[PDB]
């Protein structure tokens, strides 16, 4: 029979941060899994005693992939603690920069992090560029010719012929691999668009710097609003709008059609990587103090019961440490959080990760695009319903197909397409508000000596929350509970597998030495380990 025994993947590449995945396989299928995060920095320890205004600058450095998101969460958190209601324009500008972040992040994830699990770049060399151009022009309104793709092929040919394969060295597809299914022409189209996406993402990121100073690590948020008076000018708005329009065209005309062609070729991937429970915090508020004012609404679902979406109660979050490298075994609500590192090595005292294990009413929760999409869909979100229905119909599958590695990957595309369109709506509202004579972008505020605050962001990987306890006007406690912590943290003190661990059970492994199927599911969650551990 097939392989039986352990597989270890360390490093898991094409993620952010340092992840070790361990699985036990039996007869060619995964029967057990451990998600082990192997770097700790301790930003929560470092923040103790500092000025709450300084928190966003430190916490932004939680992660430069999901850059800006933590600055936004800490600023929302200290805005909340201080009781300031920022001006409408600060809400628009913050929301527009976050929308741009999602488009950059998801485009780079699909092409530069996920697609080498499914695309054999060297097989593109054997493709017929004329055939490939016809396929590419059939799936997109954009017209692609044989010469267009030959140019890509020629460039790849000179690259491979030098013998210096660079980032493709020892790829799992080299020489062929039974779990890689694409024909040469589809591998060429995807490879062309991988290369294209390397330059398009420059524009997508630039859109953030138009208002937000720079990418990575924006520098335009303050307690009480934003600092960028230049963001009010017609010139900056026009610059942003042109970059957004080009980024949206790429999403609509290149990314989603490629996602659909690859998903169709890998329809067996509707059978692996499903999960039970979903949490999402909502995003793009009209009111900074009301989550239900967001374009996407918060919600909680247990055991895929989308007919009974539960309200999100922020007091029902606790972070477990029994299987994590921290002192003791007591789970804590983040306003009573503890970050007390204590390393025991891999599986010492049953501990195997630097991530805590967040649980909602005791349950492990997937967060991220699949949670945001399915919950919005089930709330009747018309835009989310319209494109997920079209994706389902194009693929010829039923909604059950969404509870899988394939469905998670498709949900990341659905949310990208929906957010790309909504950024235009937000831009228009912003323009309209300026036209009414509202040029205010920052509000005054005062620091309380004692306060509690929380800030909620639905980031490209899911529900992000920052929690502060202010004591003597300083940071008494600052806790980050980050989307990858939910999804990729370890087991809790009830020994419940986290979403990634549980999703790996059942994974087939054709070749234990090149376990691309494990990577396909792990990458579908878009792990960020600097985020998860901080």
């Amino acid at each position: 029979s097939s392989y039986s025994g352990p597989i270890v993947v360390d490093p898991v590449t094409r993620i952010e941060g340092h992840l070790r995945i361990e699985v036990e396989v039996e007869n060619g299928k995964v029967k057990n899994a451990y998600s082990s995060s192997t770097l700790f920095r301790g930003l929560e320890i470092i923040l103790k005693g500092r000025d709450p205004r300084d928190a966003q600058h430190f916490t932004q450095r939680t992660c430069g992939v999901c850059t800006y998101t933590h600055a936004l969460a800490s600023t929302r958190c200290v805005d909340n603690a201080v009781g300031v209601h920022i001006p409408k324009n600060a809400t628009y500008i913050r929301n527009l920069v976050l929308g741009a972040q999602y488009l950059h992040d998801h485009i780079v994830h699909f092409y530069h992090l996920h697609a080498l699990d499914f695309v054999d770049v060297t097989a593109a060399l054997k493709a017929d560029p004329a055939k490939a151009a016809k396929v590419a022009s059939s799936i997109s309104p954009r017209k692609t010719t044989a010469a267009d793709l030959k140019a890509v092929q020629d460039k790849l040919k000179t690259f491979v012929e030098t013998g210096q394969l660079g980032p493709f060295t020892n790829a799992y597809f080299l020489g062929g691999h039974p779990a890689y299914y694409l024909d040469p022409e589809t591998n060429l189209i995807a490879t062309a668009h991988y290369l294209e996406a390397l330059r398009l993402q420059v524009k997508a990121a630039r859109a953030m710097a138009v208002f937000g100073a720079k990418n990575p690590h924006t520098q335009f948020t303050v307690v009480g609003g934003v600092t960028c008076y230049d963001a009010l000018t017609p010139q900056r708005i026009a610059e942003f709008e042109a970059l957004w329009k080009e980024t949206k065209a790429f999403v609509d005309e290149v990314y989603i059609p490629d996602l659909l062609v690859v998903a169709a070729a890998y329809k067996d991937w509707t059978q692996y990587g499903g999960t039970d429970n979903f949490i999402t915090f909502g995003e793009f508020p009209k009111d900074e103090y009301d989550l239900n004012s967001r374009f996407f609404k918060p919600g909680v679902v247990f055991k895929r019961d989308f007919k009974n979406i539960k309200p999100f109660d922020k007091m029902q979050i606790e972070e477990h440490v029994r299987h994590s490298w921290y002192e003791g075994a007591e789970a804590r609500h983040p306003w009573k959080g503890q970050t007390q590192p204590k390393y025991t090595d891999l599986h010492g005292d049953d501990r195997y990760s630097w991530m805590k294990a967040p649980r909602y009413m005791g349950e492990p929760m997937e967060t991220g695009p699949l949670a945001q999409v399915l919950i919005a869909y089930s709330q009747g979100h018309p835009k989310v319903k319209a494109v997920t229905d079209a994706v389902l119909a194009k693929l010829g599958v039923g909604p059950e197909a969404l509870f899988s590695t394939l469905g998670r990957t498709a949900a990341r595309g659905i949310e990208t397409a929906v957010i790309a369109e909504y950024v235009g709506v937000m831009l228009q509202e912003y323009k309209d508000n300026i036209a009414k004579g509202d040029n205010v972008i920052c509000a005054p505020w005062e620091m309380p000596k004692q306060a509690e605050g929380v800030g909620f962001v639905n980031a490209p990987r899911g529900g992000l929350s920052h929690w502060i306890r202010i004591e003597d006007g300083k940071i008494g406690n600052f806790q980050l509970v980050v989307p990858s912590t939910w999804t990729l943290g370890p087991r809790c003190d009830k020994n419940k597998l986290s979403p990634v661990e549980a999703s790996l059970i059942g994974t087939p492994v054709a070749d234990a030495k090149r376990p691309v199927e494990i990577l396909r599911t792990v990458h579908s969650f878009d792990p960020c380990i600097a985020c998860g551990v901080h």
């Binding site: 360390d10 590449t13 094409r14 993620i15 952010e16 070790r20 770097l39 700790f40 920095r41 301790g42 320890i45 470092i46 000025d51 205004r53 300084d54 600058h57 430190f58 450095r61 992660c63 430069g64 850059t67 992090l113 080498l116 690259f159 030098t162 013998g163 210096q164 660079g166 980032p167 060295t169 020892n170 790829a171 799992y172 290369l195 330059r199 420059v202 990121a205 630039r206 953030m208 710097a209 138009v210 937000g212 100073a213 720079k214 990418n215 990575p216 690590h217 520098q219 303050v222 600092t227 960028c228 230049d230 963001a231 590192p341 390393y343 891999l346 040029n439 920052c442 509000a443 600097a530």
Partner: protein, 267 residues
């Protein structure tokens, strides 16, 4: 992964947020596809490489032992407390990995304030004993060129590499081992708000009409006067930089800036 025609780059990730890697993806003229296909051979890089696990480790060994030589680019600080335990890749500590690989490089570039000077995880109380590359590896003779910033301007990385490939040597470096061609001026002496500074025209708050009109941000904490970087000159993403976005400089290309420049809104 390599040998011949293009110079081999081994890119390591220690204790880092991956913002420095993202900054290189923003490379402009040349863009990152030209860089990876034409200029350089990128032979190890955990964020974007195809291989994982054992296959990735084999790719790394093959690149570092190549008879053709490699250049190392290092992102992130090295955690040294508790014998390096706080950071491991392939179940090796980052301290050990860098100890074994970086002395074999023909040249080492520390990219970003974490790799140059220790960075965010080295801020007080530094629970993981994080250190910059040259501090951590002093005893081994490693002297990395330091390209500072959080993250640095990618113009500064590509310019340093191109220099090095041309001249077979480091450019002139300052006393923090940073190239003077990029770090020789304060961001303040380059700043468009300098005439307001000279006139004592300071914004007293971010909501004020003075801030709306572009007055100097020094009273609001700007660290431009004590920070060396080329931000106002090169800008970021071909379009902006912190004080043109109305926010003070937080000093992010200086050693220990998380503790030296804080509170960020005071001077």
């Amino acid at each position: 992964l390599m040998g011949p025609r293009r110079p081999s780059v081994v890119y390591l990730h220690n204790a880092e947020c991956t913002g420095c890697s993202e900054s290189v993806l923003r490379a402009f003229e040349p863009y990152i596809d030209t860089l990876i296909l034409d200029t350089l051979s990128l032979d190890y890089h955990e964020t974007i490489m195809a291989a994982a696990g054992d296959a990735a480790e084999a790719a790394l060994e093959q690149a570092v032992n190549s008879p053709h030589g490699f250049i190392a680019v290092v992102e992130g600080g090295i955690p040294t407390a508790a014998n390096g335990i706080y950071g491991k890749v392939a179940n090796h500590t980052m301290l050990d990995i860098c100890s074994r690989i970086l002395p074999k490089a023909q040249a080492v570039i520390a990219y970003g304030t974490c790799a140059t000077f220790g960075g965010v995880q080295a801020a007080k109380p530094n629970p993981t004993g994080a250190k910059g590359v040259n501090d951590a590896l002093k005893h081994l003779g490693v002297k990395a060129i330091n390209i500072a910033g959080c993250p640095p301007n990618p113009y500064n990385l590509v310019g340093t590499i191109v220099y090095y490939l041309k001249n077979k040597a480091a450019p002139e470096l300052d006393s923090l081992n940073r190239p003077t061609m990029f770090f020789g001026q304060t961001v303040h002496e380059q700043c468009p708000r300098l005439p307001h500074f000279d006139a004592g025209e300071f914004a007293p708050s971010f909501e004020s009409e003075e801030a709306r009109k572009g007055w100097c941000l020094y009273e609001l904490g700007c660290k431009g006067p004590v920070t060396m970087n080329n931000c106002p000159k090169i800008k970021f993403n071909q379009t902006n930089w912190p004080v043109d976005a109305g926010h003070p400089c937080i000093g992010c290309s200086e050693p220990d800036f998380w503790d030296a420049m804080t509170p960020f809104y005071q001077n």
